[PDB]
């Protein structure tokens with residue numbers, strides 16, 4: 001148990017603040033720190049911190065306490081018959097994935113990096129490539145133990161007597177208390193592999209058409225990279241990757257011996273093999289166009305996790321960036337296209353772009369995902385950006401969509417509240433379970449959730 005004044009930022013490395021960071025594997029010691037903050041009521045409160053993968057300010061508390069949860073990382077049990085895992089909130093999804101595979105169990109929702117805690121996964125109600133078929137992380141929690149402001153540990157379930165507080169904690173960014181422990185229902189699987197279909201579109205219109213032609217219902221997993229820099233018609237052209245978990249008999253004979261094995265992250269990546277880039281005299285001409293179309297079009301390709309899910313891993317080596325993520329309701333297709341147009345003409349160039357059609361939402365009043373067009377872009381920080389993303393906020397807002405707290409460090413409270421029309425409902429729950437504001441964060445203060 002060590003308390004240390006530490007300078008903390010999100011993954012985006014901005015808006016730093018200084019907090020007292022408690023790092024203890026001792027659960028009783030955590031209960032006491034919270035009991036202390038509640039006693040000298042009130043101060044600048046406390047907030048949990050997972051692995052720090054949120055880009056913004058949700059896991060920090062300037063001039064307050066921050067409880068690092070990563071030492072509470074015991075997997076208590078895994079059961080293949082019930083498909084249930086019982087794990088501390090500090091367990092991470094990579095650790096969990098590894099521990100569970102031998103049981104034929106699969107982490108039901110995986111984000112774009114496995115370095116996130118169970119606590120972070122719940123508090124941000126994270127989504128992945130399978131949202132349209134599996135919903136978000138919150139949908140899969142069968143119980144969790146929440147340390148509240150009064151110093152008690154409350155056992156919450158999605159349909160029990162504490163359902164309301166359960167669903168306020170899902171997506172609650174740690175502002176209902178500290179998730180100590182949870183039970184997750186896993187997805188059964190017979191292999192660690194995917195059967196994947198790849199498609200390449202020529203334009204924004206094609207990308208939308210492919211996601212609206214009914215084909216999505218044939219794949220449990222689906223996401224795309226899209227072009228956000230090229231002028232129309234090239235704007236919004238996409239490499240789409242869709243699939244489902246493979247069964248044993250679908251594997252080639254070579255891989256049937258160990259169907260649930262995970263492959264090691266290799267020493268040599270593509271920057272190590274080709275140091276001078278991948279560009280040749282063909283890349284930007286018709287043969288290049290033809291080559292990209294071909295490599296990105298395929299059917300029934302067997303892929304492991306890295307290949308199917310982390311296709312940025314092969315580009316290795318390739319701070320001053322602003323991550324922006326929003327979703328626009330399904331029906332607002334024209335408005336969605338408009339927003340992509342605004343991005344392209346902005347003079348702000350993003351290369352790392354995610355496109356995904358979200359499925360049905362859950363009952364959490366602060367849950368980010370709603371059915372519709374989800375987009376992430378990554379803008380280099382340069383003159384004009386701050387004021388331009390505010391304009392984007394305005395358009396996202398008026399088009400019925402919202403920003404994601406896990407990605408935000410700079411939107412206003414007014415915008416956020418308008419984007420989340422159930423925020424008042426949520427605030428009423430939070431105020432009932434934390435009258436003295438024992439739990440607090442830089443985000444809570446910025447977005448007036450405190």
Ligand SMILES: Cc1cc2nc3c(=O)[nH]c(=O)nc-3n(C[C@H](O)[C@H](O)[C@H](O)COP(=O)(O)OP(=O)(O)OC[C@H]3O[C@@H](n4cnc5c(N)ncnc54)[C@H](O)[C@@H]3O)c2cc1C
Pocket residue numbers: 011047048049050051052053054055058059069089090110111112113115116117118119120121123124125126127128129172173174175177178179180406407
């Ligand atoms: C490369 C990359 C790819 C990503 N891809 C995706 C994606 O595909 N989908 C997606 O949804 N997100 C994605 N994210 C965002 C990420 O999944 C979330 O920010 C997640 O919350 C990070 O978990 P963490 O353990 O690092 O939590 P932190 O960022 O440390 O904390 C996040 C929030 O969770 C709260 N919290 C953490 N632990 C606890 C606890 N034990 N009890 C109560 N509250 C707690 C904190 O108070 C804070 O509000 C991505 C992030 C990166 C960097």
Ligand SMILES: O=C(O)c1nc2ccc(C(F)(F)F)cc2nc1NCc1ccc(Cl)cc1
Pocket residue numbers: 111112113127128129130222223224225311312323352353354355356374376
């Ligand atoms: O960096 C992030 O914050 C991120 N956010 C994501 C949000 C949603 C999705 C989803 F839509 F696929 F679920 C994937 C994400 N991948 C992410 N990162 C991995 C990645 C993989 C490929 C690309 Cl073209 C760009 C990013």
Ligand SMILES: C[C@H](CO)OC[C@@H](C)OC[C@@H](C)O
Pocket residue numbers: 112223224225239240241309310311312353354355
């Ligand atoms: C962005 C989305 C999430 O992982 O999938 C990207 C795939 C479809 O494209 C591969 C990239 C590297 O070109």
